[PDB]
Design an enzyme around this catalytic site. Sequence first.
Site, PDB file in Angstrom:
ATOM      1  CG  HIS B   8      -0.268   0.042   2.527  1.00  0.00           C
ATOM      2  ND1 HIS B   8       0.365   1.172   3.000  1.00  0.00           N
ATOM      3  CD2 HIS B   8      -0.105  -0.907   3.477  1.00  0.00           C
ATOM      4  CE1 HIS B   8       0.889   0.916   4.186  1.00  0.00           C
ATOM      5  NE2 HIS B   8       0.618  -0.339   4.498  1.00  0.00           N
ATOM      6  CG  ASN B  14       7.327   4.769   4.593  1.00  0.00           C
ATOM      7  OD1 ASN B  14       7.711   3.620   4.814  1.00  0.00           O
ATOM      8  ND2 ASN B  14       7.796   5.499   3.586  1.00  0.00           N
ATOM      9  CD  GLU B  74       3.043  -5.355   8.188  1.00  0.00           C
ATOM     10  OE1 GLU B  74       3.396  -4.653   7.217  1.00  0.00           O
ATOM     11  OE2 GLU B  74       3.541  -6.465   8.457  1.00  0.00           O
TER      12      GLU B  74
END
Lengths: 170, 171
Positions: B8, B14, B74
């Site tokens: 994704h 991130n 995840e």
Amino acid sequence: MELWLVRHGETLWNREGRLLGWTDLPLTAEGEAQARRLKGALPSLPAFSSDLLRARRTAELAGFSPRLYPELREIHFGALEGALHETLDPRYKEALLRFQGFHPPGGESLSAFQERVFRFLEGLKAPAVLFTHGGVVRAVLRALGEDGLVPPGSAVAVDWPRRVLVRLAL
Amino acid sequence: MELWLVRHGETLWNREGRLLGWTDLPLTAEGEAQARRLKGALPSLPAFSSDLLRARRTAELAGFSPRLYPELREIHFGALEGALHETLDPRYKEALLRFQGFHPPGGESLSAFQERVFRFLEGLKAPAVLFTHGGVVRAVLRALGEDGLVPPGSAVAVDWPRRVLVRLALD
């Protein structure tokens, strides 16, 4: 599907020539050295291991943290555990050589053993490194039409259930 | 069997370097841009996606209408959710680095995660595109014997469970 069959490092019964099944013997110093050498060759795939000490320790020294499965154990020799291969009744020697018709008192039948091993193998859902025993490695190799004898601390990679990929003996 | 796996688009964690598992964060502006660039680059096959927002939205912006499956999520980091990777105790850092023996309190073990992911892949009857997460792609690539890190909004095609076919990243 890629599977690495690893035979655990040596124990005292290997040099002694005694049948080693469910007797939970530890690795010798050399067996530990063999396990450590595997760290520089085995791929970092999901790992599984027989729950017996010698297999678990081999996996650990080789740099893995395996999911434990008793299905990966060597065959249970029953009353024959620890018996000198040299003094086995001819009927037992013959069966172990031909790999058929072996059912030690108080132990597992070679047939039930194979049923246990292949059920586990067919259940795998991704490539893996399997820390196991000589008899298990032998069963898989023979299933692929190859000679199944491999040294302690060595490994064989196979593309299950098609063919053998490569043998690794140090 | 041919399977396309898509990581994704990026979220704030991130760039921040925080463990992002079941925490349901949205895509960043750049994250949506990455997902849009995937439209027209992925094959027209049945689509499946993690039910988490960032994954679902990536699928949507990529032009797909996937069936949602939590099995594609995840790994659940438990108490480690949101933890700065940089400050993780050595045991956890090494466990994630070597992808082994990871047991986060209140979360999923790596072994449980792998079993979940691989069981889902085994159930697939035909080629499909899977909108998922970095850890899932990593588990798959690693099982196929390759480095498993790929950029957000990127994709990989594999012939499961035999080999990797292609890695696709766009700018």
